[PDB]
Amino acid sequence: GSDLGKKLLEAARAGQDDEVRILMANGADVNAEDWMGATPLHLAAQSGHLEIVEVLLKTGADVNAHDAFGWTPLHLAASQGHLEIVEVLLKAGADVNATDMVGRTPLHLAARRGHLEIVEVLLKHGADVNAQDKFGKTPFDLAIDNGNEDIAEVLQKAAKLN
What we know:
Blueprint: H1 4-14, H2 17-25, H3 40-47, H4 50-58, H5 73-80, H6 83-91, H7 106-113, H8 116-124, H9 139-145, H10 149-160
Helix pairs in contact: 1-2, 1-3, 3-4, 3-5, 4-6, 5-6, 5-7, 6-8, 7-8, 7-9, 8-10, 9-10
C-alpha cells in the first residue's frame, strides 16, 4: 500500500510504540506531516508519550519542526504540562524561544496553563522572560491574566536577574 506516514502519525498520537516500531521498520517517514502540519514528534509530545518522543529524536525527527499554527513539539509539551518531554526536547536542541503564529513562546504557554515546574525548566534553558507576543503580553502578563500567582512571582524574580 502506501499509508505508512499516515499510520505512523496515528500510532504516535495513540502512544502505540510497537506500531511505531513496525511502521518505521517497514519504511515509514518519521517526519511525515498530518493535515495541520503536525509530525509524529508533535503528536507524541502533545499526548505525553515520552518514550516515543525519545525514540523519534534518536531516529531523525526534526525537534524544531513547526506546524500550521507555528507550534513546535516544545510548545505542545509545555502547554500540555509534560515536564519530562520538555526536558528531553530541550536536551535534543529544541529552540526554547520559538514563537507560534501569535508570537507566543513555550514559556508563554506554560505560564498561561499554570505549569510551574515547566516554567522553571524553560527559564533554566534560557527562555526569554521579556518576550512579547503579538498582543504585547509577556509570560508574566499571561500568568497574571490566568490567576497563576506563583508562576507570576517566579517570573518577576527571574526578570530581576537578567
